[PDB]
Write a protein that binds this ligand. Structure first.
Ligand SMILES: [Mg+2]
Ligand SMILES: [Mg+2]
Ligand SMILES: [Mg+2]
Ligand SMILES: [Mg+2]
Ligand SMILES: [Mg+2]
Ligand SMILES: [Mg+2]
Ligand SMILES: [Mg+2]
Ligand SMILES: [Mg+2]
Ligand SMILES: [Mg+2]
Ligand SMILES: [Mg+2]
Ligand SMILES: [Mg+2]
Ligand SMILES: [Mg+2]
Ligand SMILES: [Mg+2]
Ligand SMILES: [Mg+2]
Ligand SMILES: [Mg+2]
Ligand SMILES: [Mg+2]
Ligand SMILES: [Mg+2]
Ligand SMILES: [Mg+2]
Ligand SMILES: [Mg+2]
Ligand SMILES: [Mg+2]
Ligand SMILES: [Mg+2]
Ligand SMILES: [Mg+2]
Ligand SMILES: [Mg+2]
Ligand SMILES: [Mg+2]
Ligand SMILES: [Mg+2]
Ligand SMILES: [Mg+2]
Ligand SMILES: [Mg+2]
Ligand SMILES: [Mg+2]
Ligand SMILES: [Mg+2]
Ligand SMILES: [Mg+2]
Ligand SMILES: [Mg+2]
Ligand SMILES: [Mg+2]
Ligand SMILES: [Mg+2]
Ligand SMILES: [Mg+2]
Ligand SMILES: [Mg+2]
Ligand SMILES: [Mg+2]
Ligand SMILES: [Mg+2]
Ligand SMILES: [Mg+2]
Ligand SMILES: [Mg+2]
Ligand SMILES: [Mg+2]
Ligand SMILES: [Zn+2]
Lengths: 252, 52, 97, 91, 135, 77
RNA sequence: UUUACUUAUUCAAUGAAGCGGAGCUGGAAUUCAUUUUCCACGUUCUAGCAUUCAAGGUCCCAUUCGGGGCUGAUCCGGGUU
RNA sequence: UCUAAGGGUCGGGUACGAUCAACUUAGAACUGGUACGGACAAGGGGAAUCUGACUGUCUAAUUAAAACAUAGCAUUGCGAUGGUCAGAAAGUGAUGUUGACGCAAU
RNA sequence: GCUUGUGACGGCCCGUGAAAAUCCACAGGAAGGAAUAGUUUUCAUGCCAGGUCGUACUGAUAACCGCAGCAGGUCUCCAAG
RNA sequence: GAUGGGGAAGCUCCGUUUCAAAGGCCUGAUUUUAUGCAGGCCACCAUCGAAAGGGAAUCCGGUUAAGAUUCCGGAACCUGG
């Protein structure tokens, strides 16, 4: 039959992002001379909403070391940072909320955000409202630093990978029931065209693996293999268990 | 604004038609003190260097 | 304690509350000791500190914001600075301060 | 003249969505609209506007905070944690 | 001490001579039928001597180091008393109540204070005083 | 687009190089509350503005009229 | 088979700006002849200010106003990281 | 056809007067072929069963429904050298101005 | 009163509700400038010039789309007692 | 949607500042002379895309068989020089 929905999302037409209103891209400062030999001061000039983002951004402005001018950066605001606060970025910087430091220079237990996977990538890990990472190890030779990500996964990355002290602001956002259909509607209106969702099981066969039958039913195991093929993979992909998760989760 | 005499585009204080006066009272004091405490900072530690 | 002293001052001496008047007091060599609230900003802090050093006037950094500094002096409003010009029966001037 | 027995602000939603969901919302609602103390100037004049953004009426400071409350449990302890660890580094 | 006395230097903090440095020459500590506030008669400087360098030769130096002065009655509440200090002898008598009222009297006052300020600056007495406060 | 009142200033316009034409208007108006009086308006057509000077005074008016440049091209009424 | 190397190949970054190596000074260090090393080696009360090859110092032009080297800002290798 | 209540503006040494302008609400007489929201305008109501929570959606032109959606609940995949998806290929592309309080799939 | 305009406020949001051309201002102080006479066109007045294309009417139970002078369809402003 | 490019047998597909030696202003030096060199900059990298978005400036009276904020009358305003 027909191309199913989850393969149409790929050509990005109606499915591309609703970008018009966003502040710009959140990133750390470029890993230049200052930030990697000493530190460098800035002022959060403004913290502000980003459409379709949970967490607020913090506009933070710095002097150019090489030219007479102001250069403005777009940070994700850690909880507690405030307009007019001074932000410190550098190896030799000091450990307070807001400042940005290389995971090497912060002891075990430090709680940081917007951390890079490789030094310099200008911020990858934990950016969603609420999330953060915690340093759990250091290996002075080959300078790695071990962290636990918000997913529970533990990764090891360069000690030079920069992070920012604290947790991303706006946490708790998802404790609030959406209550009604429109509050989702407007939510997704400023994200992408992913909402509402027809159940495949309400479609006809041309439309979906799940479509058709004289009653609605999936008709075969809804757990699909990784080696499945486009047009096939709808359901629980590569699912290694299935059913109500009873008992405490949480990685050992 | 290009069809109008320059007095319609300033007040005669420093930072005239740009910053709100109360705001220039401010940056004056800050400027003053910080430049002062800067002299204070250097002689505290000029001593420290010879007193250790 | 420090609050108890303040209270004696309040019920037996001369004081003035607020930023501007403790400057009238500071310009005029009338102040004996100013007391400064935790959260009152650093520019104000610095400027009082400068005014003070010129009048050879010792200062006290009240640990506790203007909300309490007000209750300290037994007033139902907030105060960010106090100026003792006459210490009553209290000894604040020639104790730890 | 007590107007409602328990819905409070949640009276706006009438009967819809089911009691329990209305409880949950009522909580964070009360939390989010309320006036808060400004750390800086000390008047209760911090109100919300766009989740996580808490900004002070007179005095004009803005603080990044919890999506429906100025300070969030987690954030807070993290603050205290950062106290503790910083201590280690000039002691 | 009652620091608003004769020698005192202070940065003006409001109004067109905003941020410029003065010297008090005569204080009216409290009162006037007019000026109903603690106020000082000051003679600041308005157009500072520009920087001078080796390259600067002959009559550029002459040109650069010209001060334009000014004289103000001013509220205390607009001065930022300074730790520094500058003598006021050569214009004790030029800066007066009487000096204000009648413009032509002011121009004369400034005339003197100017020659008095340039004299001071060359052979660099009171060095701070002859250099812009930036903000 | 302009009004004028200094009788001196006026005269200076009337001899101002580019002022070829001018006109005098006569208006019956009333005085205060009671009677009427002969208002008269002196309009000089400058290049970029039409200046008009009102002489409420009948007397001052006539003496003003003979003051006018003998080369000016006045429009009566 | 393991585990090293970097020039192929691969990924990221930047208006390819401060790399790698040595040296100055400081100084923790304890000297088993004297240095055998290791860290450093301009910025953190404050919602200011930081631009004209830089002021200074020193040498040249043939003294004009202008203007130029050097230093200020240490050497060596041209692997942008 | 009457009555009552509800306002503006002025001068008062350091109790009131004077004037101008507004439909509202209630009460009371009288009156008629007992009529009077006089045309116009303008909810039928009640007790139960089945069924979808609700508002919302669709078969333009025989089906508006109990069907689809929805919030809510639960499950799956993935830390970027990635998950899902596009393309004949690529120094190609969507998610992505994104980062698990996220994106993708039921 | 009615319609429209506008202000200072207040509600709401896991929604917080474009861009760029263009204009001004300020910080800066390169440099240029007077007494035998210099600076000044962001004050006034004064002089010349402003091209190319559209511009009628209909806008609907007859000027458009439905084979048509079709009871259908087709975006909007003004609005008396 | 061109361009240095990269795919594709090829019609062409991808990319839009992207692994590119990407370009132009202010005046000075000319007083053989018309404009070479002398600085210092600025590195923004096409272009099309709104007759409802942004946007320099005009009004009233009169006038035609049929045009009018467009003619005539009078009175303005903007941009450039
Ligand atoms: Mg896009
Ligand atoms: Mg949709
Ligand atoms: Mg679903
Ligand atoms: Mg569904
Ligand atoms: Mg079906
Ligand atoms: Mg099928
Ligand atoms: Mg199947
Ligand atoms: Mg089926
Ligand atoms: Mg089923
Ligand atoms: Mg003005
Ligand atoms: Mg100036
Ligand atoms: Mg580089
Ligand atoms: Mg009445
Ligand atoms: Mg009764
Ligand atoms: Mg239904
Ligand atoms: Mg319905
Ligand atoms: Mg149908
Ligand atoms: Mg059909
Ligand atoms: Mg229906
Ligand atoms: Mg349920
Ligand atoms: Mg290739
Ligand atoms: Mg309307
Ligand atoms: Mg708003
Ligand atoms: Mg302006
Ligand atoms: Mg020059
Ligand atoms: Mg002009
Ligand atoms: Mg042309
Ligand atoms: Mg027409
Ligand atoms: Mg017709
Ligand atoms: Mg028809
Ligand atoms: Mg193309
Ligand atoms: Mg165009
Ligand atoms: Mg347009
Ligand atoms: Mg338009
Ligand atoms: Mg007409
Ligand atoms: Mg005609
Ligand atoms: Mg017509
Ligand atoms: Mg005309
Ligand atoms: Mg004309
Ligand atoms: Mg002009
Ligand atoms: Zn506040």
């Amino acid at each position: 039959g027909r191309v199913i929905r989850n393969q149409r999302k790929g050509a990005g037409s109606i499915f591309t992002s609703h970008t018009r209103l966003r502040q710009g891209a959140a990133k750390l400062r470029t890993l230049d001379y200052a930030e990697r030999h000493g530190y460098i001061r800035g002022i959060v000039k403004q913290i502000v909403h980003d459409s379709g983002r949970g967490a607020p951004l913090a506009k933070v402005v710095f002097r150019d070391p090489y030219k007479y001018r102001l250069r403005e950066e777009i940070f994700i605001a850690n909880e507690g940072v405030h307009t007019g606060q001074f932000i410190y970025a550098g190896k030799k910087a000091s450990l307070n909320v807001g400042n940005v430091l290389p995971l090497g220079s912060v002891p075990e237990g430090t709680i940081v955000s917007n951390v890079e996977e490789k030094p310099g990538d200008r911020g990858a890990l934990a950016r969603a409202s609420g999330n953060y990472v915690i340093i759990i190890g250091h290996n002075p030779d080959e300078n790695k630093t071990r962290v636990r990500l918000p997913s529970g996964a533990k990764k090891v990355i360069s000690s030079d990978a920069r992070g920012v002290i604290g947790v991303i602001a706006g946490g708790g956002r998802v404790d609030k029931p959406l209550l009604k259909a429109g509050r989702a509607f407007h939510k997704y209106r400023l994200k992408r065209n992913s909402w509402p969702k027809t159940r495949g099981v309400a479609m006809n066969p041309v439309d979906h693996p799940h479509g058709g039958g004289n009653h609605q039913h999936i008709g075969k195991a809804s757990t699909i293999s990784r080696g499945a093929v486009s047009g096939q993979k709808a359901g629980l992909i590569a699912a290694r268990r299935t059913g109500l998760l009873r008992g405490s989760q949480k990685t050992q | 604004y290009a069809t109008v005499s320059k007095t319609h585009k300033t007040v005669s204080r420093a930072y005239g038609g740009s910053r709100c006066a109360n705001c220039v009272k401010e940056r004056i004091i800050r400027a003053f003190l910080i430049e002062e405490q800067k002299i204070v900072k250097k002689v505290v530690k000029e001593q420290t260097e010879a007193a250790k | 304690s420090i609050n108890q002293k303040l209270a004696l001052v309040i019920k037996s001496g001369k004081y003035t509350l607020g930023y501007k008047s403790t400057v009238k007091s500071l310009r005029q060599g009338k102040s004996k000791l100013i007391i400064i609230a935790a959260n009152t900003p650093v520019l104000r802090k610095s400027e009082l500190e400068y005014y003070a050093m010129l009048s050879k006037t010792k200062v006290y950094y009240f640990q506790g914001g203007n909300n309490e500094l007000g209750t300290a002096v037994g007033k139902l409003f907030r105060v960010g600075v106090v100026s003792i010009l006459e210490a009553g029966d209290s000894d604040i001037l020639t104790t730890l301060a | 003249a007590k107007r409602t027995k328990k819905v409070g602000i949640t009276g706006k939603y009438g009967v819809r969505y089911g009691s329990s969901l209305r409880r949950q919302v009522k909580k964070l609602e009360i939390q989010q609209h309320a006036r808060y103390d400004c750390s800086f100037c000390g008047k209760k004049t911090v109100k919300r506007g766009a989740a996580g953004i808490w900004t002070c009426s007179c005095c004009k400071k803005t603080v990044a905070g919890g999506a429906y409350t100025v300070s969030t449990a987690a954030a807070a302890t993290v603050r205290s944690t950062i106290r503790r660890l910083r201590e280690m580094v000039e002691a | 001490a009652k620091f608003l006395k004769a020698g005192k230097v202070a940065v003006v903090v409001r109004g067109r001579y905003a941020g410029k440095k003065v010297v008090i020459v005569k204080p009216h500590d409290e009162g006037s039928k007019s000026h109903p506030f603690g106020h000082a008669l000051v003679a600041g400087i308005e157009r500072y001597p520009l920087k001078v360098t080796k390259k600067h030769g002959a009559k550029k130096v002459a040109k650069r180091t010209k001060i334009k002065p000014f004289i103000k009655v001013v509220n205390y509440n607009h001065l930022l008393p300074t730790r520094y200090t500058l003598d006021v002898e050569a214009f004790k008598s030029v800066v007066s109540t009487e000096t204000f009222e009648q413009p032509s009297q002011r121009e004369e006052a400034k005339k003197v204070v100017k020659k008095a300020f340039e004299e001071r600056h060359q052979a660099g007495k009171n060095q701070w005083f002859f250099s812009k406060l930036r903000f | 687009a302009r009004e004028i009142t200094d009788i001196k200033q006026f005269l200076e316009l009337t001899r101002r190089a580019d002022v070829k034409t001018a006109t005098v208007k006569i208006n019956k108006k009333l005085n205060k509350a009671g009677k009427p009086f002969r208002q008269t308006k002196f309009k000089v057509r400058g290049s970029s503005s039409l200046y008009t000077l009102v002489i409420n005074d009948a007397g001052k008016a006539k003496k003003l009229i003979q003051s006018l440049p003998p080369t000016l091209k006045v429009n009566r009424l």
